[PDB]
Design a protein around this motif. Structure first.
Motif, PDB file in Angstrom:
ATOM      1  N   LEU C 106       0.825  -1.201   0.000  1.00 30.97           N
ATOM      2  CA  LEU C 106       0.000   0.000   0.000  1.00 30.97           C
ATOM      3  C   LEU C 106       0.860   1.253   0.000  1.00 30.97           C
ATOM      4  O   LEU C 106       0.566   2.219  -0.712  1.00 30.97           O
ATOM      5  CB  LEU C 106      -0.932  -0.008   1.208  1.00 30.97           C
ATOM      6  CG  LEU C 106      -2.084  -1.006   1.129  1.00 30.97           C
ATOM      7  CD1 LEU C 106      -2.617  -1.308   2.511  1.00 30.97           C
ATOM      8  CD2 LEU C 106      -3.184  -0.481   0.234  1.00 30.97           C
ATOM      9  N   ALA C 107       1.935   1.256   0.786  1.00 31.88           N
ATOM     10  CA  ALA C 107       2.815   2.417   0.819  1.00 31.88           C
ATOM     11  C   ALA C 107       3.432   2.674  -0.548  1.00 31.88           C
ATOM     12  O   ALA C 107       3.535   3.825  -0.984  1.00 31.88           O
ATOM     13  CB  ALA C 107       3.905   2.215   1.869  1.00 31.88           C
ATOM     14  N   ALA C 108       3.847   1.614  -1.241  1.00 31.13           N
ATOM     15  CA  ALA C 108       4.443   1.785  -2.560  1.00 31.13           C
ATOM     16  C   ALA C 108       3.456   2.407  -3.535  1.00 31.13           C
ATOM     17  O   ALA C 108       3.819   3.288  -4.320  1.00 31.13           O
ATOM     18  CB  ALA C 108       4.938   0.441  -3.087  1.00 31.13           C
ATOM     19  N   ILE C 109       2.200   1.959  -3.505  1.00 38.22           N
ATOM     20  CA  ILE C 109       1.189   2.543  -4.380  1.00 38.22           C
ATOM     21  C   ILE C 109       0.996   4.015  -4.052  1.00 38.22           C
ATOM     22  O   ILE C 109       0.908   4.860  -4.948  1.00 38.22           O
ATOM     23  CB  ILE C 109      -0.136   1.768  -4.262  1.00 38.22           C
ATOM     24  CG1 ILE C 109       0.031   0.337  -4.768  1.00 38.22           C
ATOM     25  CG2 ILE C 109      -1.227   2.474  -5.040  1.00 38.22           C
ATOM     26  CD1 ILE C 109      -1.014  -0.612  -4.243  1.00 38.22           C
ATOM     27  N   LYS C 110       0.937   4.345  -2.762  1.00 38.42           N
ATOM     28  CA  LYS C 110       0.727   5.732  -2.363  1.00 38.42           C
ATOM     29  C   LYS C 110       1.844   6.627  -2.880  1.00 38.42           C
ATOM     30  O   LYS C 110       1.587   7.733  -3.366  1.00 38.42           O
ATOM     31  CB  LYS C 110       0.632   5.823  -0.842  1.00 38.42           C
ATOM     32  CG  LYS C 110      -0.099   7.045  -0.339  1.00 38.42           C
ATOM     33  CD  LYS C 110      -0.554   6.857   1.092  1.00 38.42           C
ATOM     34  CE  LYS C 110      -0.895   8.181   1.743  1.00 38.42           C
ATOM     35  NZ  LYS C 110      -2.036   8.057   2.683  1.00 38.42           N
TER      36      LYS C 110
END
Lengths: 117, 50, 139, 132, 201
Positions: C106-110
RNA sequence: UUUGCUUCCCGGUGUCGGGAGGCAUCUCUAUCUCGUGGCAACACGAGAGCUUAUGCCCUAUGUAUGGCCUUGGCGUCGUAGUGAUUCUGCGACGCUUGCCAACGCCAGAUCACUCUGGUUCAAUGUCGGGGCGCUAAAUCACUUGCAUACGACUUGG
RNA sequence: GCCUAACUUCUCGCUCAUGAGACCCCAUAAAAGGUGUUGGUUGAUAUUGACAGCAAUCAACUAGCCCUGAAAAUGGAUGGCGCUUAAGCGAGAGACCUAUACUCC
RNA sequence: UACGCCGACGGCGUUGGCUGCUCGUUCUAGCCCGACAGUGUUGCGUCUUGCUGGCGGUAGUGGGUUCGUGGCGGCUAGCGUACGUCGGUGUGAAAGUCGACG
């Protein structure tokens, strides 16, 4: 509550069962001929070779399949596309049981698996 | 397209709608007649004439 | 022997589920499980409700989109036996692995500049529209 | 009634067959059905093609009967036929279709979102205009 | 390949046999077909050929009892219906069920007066050589006994007048829509960028 | 049909089938579109593979809070129009419906797919409750004679 | 092309018939004709300007399709529908369909 | 757990169907150069620019044609089981479900 990304449409290609493999006075019910939507060549028809297909019909007695919560009147016959037929995008299919002749002109769902894209 | 009947139909005209006029209650056109003296019925009749 | 993975399937690739209750969902591919040969994938359960489970590559379309999956550290106890089948109830253990795995994803997508579309894309189900023919669609 | 004609030097667009989508120049006319064309600068070899597969463009080169490939190349480059053709809606539609055919699933999703947002805004503006 | 709705086909400028064979194939493959303006369908060859063919068709009647003999329909819709019937196995259940899905009309009935109609370019009459005569099924029907050529002409004229008015209104609305897009340009610039980049405009 | 029953709604319950949404000018085919000048014919300027049905619309997590933008859809009702009976325009009133902070936050999982869209949609029959609402006719037997092999036909109580 | 599984597939010509034609046996057609159209043969004239009227032309032949020759009795047959830059006639090209035949199990 | 009755996905064997690259082989050019002859010829006349024809060259460049006791791929079918990974069902009744006939 809304289930967070619900279903939005089909995941199958529309087709119809146009008849069996035949000459003019013979008929081989072991092989079925399907016409797919949007397919017009043997090159395009070759894309769907080896894809599974299903024919859904309605019966009288209801069945509560495991994994289903409500008794349903729908039954299915499963099959698979084997090769293109002719030049104009028809395909040949083989079904677990020979397709009933009453399926002529009725919907056949061409699923997208087994996938190889 | 449509048919408009007169407000008062003669008994002998109404008999034609029957096979047992004497034995019946002679209810033909009884409700239609009232439409001629009604606000909505008059509007419907005028629309038919139009 | 283990099954041969398709060339298009690499870690971080976004796949389309073709069968099951999750058919049409866009999920993230993590790794090919060694024993069974199935695919350990998890479209972040936060986004599309797809939990951490296995799926065979025959029932998946591998798209060209890839998310940065280099940050996720899969726990060692997550293997084929972990998903081996026993009224299913999500064990409290299971939830923690999903949080552990999804958090870097999720952090990478953000961080990705397209996070607006990436989140919406993963939260939507693929479907065949009008005049959309799979033999001419580039996934 | 007819503006464009099959004449020596006419630039034709191959509509079907081997070199589909390319431009060539008519260097000779064999009969009522066959023309010898040579698109040296558009990757088309000097060949004879049936006119049924060809479409006339608006450009005519200053060629000679049976101009050799070198002369055709010179005229093509001098006239900048490719650049001028790329400015026409004929070529723009081909480019758009080329882009469209290679859309990925993610690109299709992005296009869907952008298109529906634009349509909503344009509909608001259209309602404003209609009220007035 | 089934169509969800019925296929509404404008019969004008179509070759009788070609359109009939196409429609027969569709009916056999399970679609429902509606043909509008069957009086505008065309038959190649001069009018005399078609008229004499129909006269010889009229000559085929049962000697014993004409009420059993061939039934010679004169309306253009029924002429097209029989042409399609000829290209079906209509004596079998398959052919009968296929034929029951066809509706052919003269003019455009009110039900279809507000729907878009299709054409089959492979059956158009413009694939004939320009220097070849052709006959109109409306004229043929009128000359062999059809009695409603004038009524259909009047009704079609009224329909065309109403359609012309609607089209003028539609042109005005289309120009307003173009203006609305131009006005919205500053707001939609962010989305227009993506749309043009992906090549849709 | 003085109990019977039409119609609308709420429920049960039988039987049956299909199997992913919407789209209105015409005329013309050896010319067409736009703009302008024209009563008209026509004229001038700019374009025109034409692949805009090979298209365009539609296209999906739930509060809250804040910033926008106020549109689009559905239903009822009331007028007005439409005749190849239904369909349209205008309102009025309701139920909703878009984007940004933002996947921020809560829920979502059935173990790998086998008929679910993971309750798919339609058509009707019947049995119960309600809401307005209505209170008929054929037929037999007599009779008539313009009718008649028998039925049938024409009349009257 | 549809009946009918398989292309309204690709190339070049010819043919308009007031019911043309359409595939071995096979389900009839002749002698004789046409200034319909399309090709060829031969002999002439023509720019020292060929024929018609106050820039090619003339004549005779030939053979492709079409036309006339071609009249029968229940209503009727390229198998039917229909087809006219064909779905006809001739030369061809790709692919495709289909036997109780061929290969393999 | 194993085993029966069925399905799915992989592997292997066998018979295939469709479809690409890549080397080479045969017979051959064109491009390019030289002279000669001709002409559907541009610009302004044993002119020029073009264009064509054989003939003579091939260094370089360089495509057609032909097929190989050639090399490397991609998609996929039927039949069988070097065999794997898994699901539905069935171990008192009964109901349901599954399987086979029909």
């Amino acid at each position: 509550r809304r289930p967070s990304a619900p279903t939005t449409g089909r995941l199958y290609v529309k087709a119809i069962f146009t008849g069996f493999k035949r000459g003019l006075r013979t008929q081989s019910e072991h092989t079925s001929l399907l016409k797919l939507e949007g397919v017009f060549n043997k090159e395009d028809a070759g894309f769907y070779a080896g894809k599974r297909v299903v024919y859904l019909y309605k019966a009288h007695n209801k069945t509560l399949k495991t994994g289903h919560t409500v008794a349903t009147r729908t039954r299915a016959i499963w099959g698979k596309i084997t090769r293109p037929h002719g030049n104009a995008g028809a395909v040949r299919a083989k079904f677990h049981h020979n397709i009933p002749p009453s399926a002529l002109g009725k919907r056949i769902r061409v699923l997208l698996y087994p996938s190889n894209i | 397209l449509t048919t408009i009947w007169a407000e008062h139909l003669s008994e002998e005209a109404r008999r034609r709608f029957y096979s047992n006029w004497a034995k019946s209650k002679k209810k033909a056109f009884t409700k239609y007649a009232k439409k001629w003296q009604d606000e909505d019925g008059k509007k419907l009749i005028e629309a038919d004439f139009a | 022997k283990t099954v041969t993975l398709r060339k298009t399937l690499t870690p971080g690739t976004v796949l389309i589920v073709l069968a099951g209750r999750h058919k049409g969902k866009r999920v993230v591919f993590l790794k090919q499980l060694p024993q069974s040969g199935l695919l350990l994938v998890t479209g972040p359960h936060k986004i599309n409700g797809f939990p951490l489970r296995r799926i065979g590559q025959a029932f998946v379309i591998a798209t060209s989109l890839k998310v940065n999956v280099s940050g996720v550290k899969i726990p060692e106890h997550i293997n084929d036996e972990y998903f081996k089948r026993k009224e299913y109830t999500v064990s409290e253990q299971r939830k923690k692995d999903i949080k552990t795995v999804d958090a870097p994803i999720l952090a990478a997508i953000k961080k990705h500049p397209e996070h607006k579309f990436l989140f919406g894309y993963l939260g939507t189900r693929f479907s065949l529209g009008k005049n959309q023919y799979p033999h001419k669609m580039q996934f | 009634v007819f503006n464009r004609v099959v004449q020596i030097g006419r630039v034709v667009f191959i509509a079907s067959g081997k070199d589909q989508g390319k431009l060539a120049a008519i260097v000779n006319v064999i009969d009522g059905n066959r023309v010898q064309i040579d698109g040296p600068s558009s990757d088309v070899t000097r060949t004879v093609r049936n006119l049924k597969d060809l479409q006339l463009t608006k450009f005519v080169l200053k060629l000679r009967v049976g101009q050799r490939t070198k002369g055709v190349k010179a005229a093509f480059d001098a006239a900048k036929v490719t650049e001028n053709f790329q400015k026409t809606q004929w070529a723009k539609k081909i480019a758009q279709r080329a882009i469209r055919a290679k859309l990925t699933d993610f690109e299709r999703y992005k296009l869907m979102k952008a298109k529906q947002m634009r349509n909503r805004i344009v509909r608001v503006e259209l309602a404003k205009l209609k009220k007035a | 390949g089934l169509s969800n709705r019925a296929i509404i086909i404008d019969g004008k400028n179509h070759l009788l046999g070609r359109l009939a064979s196409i429609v027969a194939k569709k009916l056999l493959q399970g679609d429902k077909v509606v043909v509008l303006r069957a009086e505008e369908i065309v038959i190649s060859g001069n009018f005399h050929r078609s008229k004499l063919k129909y006269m010889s068709f009229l000559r085929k009647r049962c000697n014993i009892n004409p009420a059993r003999g061939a039934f010679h329909y004169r309306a253009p819709g029924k002429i097209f219906w029989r042409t399609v019937r000829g290209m079906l196995p209509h004596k079998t259940n398959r052919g009968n069920e296929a034929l029951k899905n066809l509706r052919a009309y003269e003019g455009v009935p009110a039900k279809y007066q507000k729907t878009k109609s299709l054409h089959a370019p492979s059956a158009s009459r413009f694939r004939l050589q320009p220097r070849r005569k052709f006959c109109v099924v409306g004229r043929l029907s009128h000359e062999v006994g059809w009695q409603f050529q004038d009524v259909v002409a009047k009704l079609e004229a009224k329909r065309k007048v109403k359609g012309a008015a609607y089209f003028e209104q539609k042109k005005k609305m289309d120009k307003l829509a173009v203006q609305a897009k131009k006005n919205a340009a500053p707001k939609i610039a962010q989305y227009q960028k993506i749309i043009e980049a992906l090549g849709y405009n």
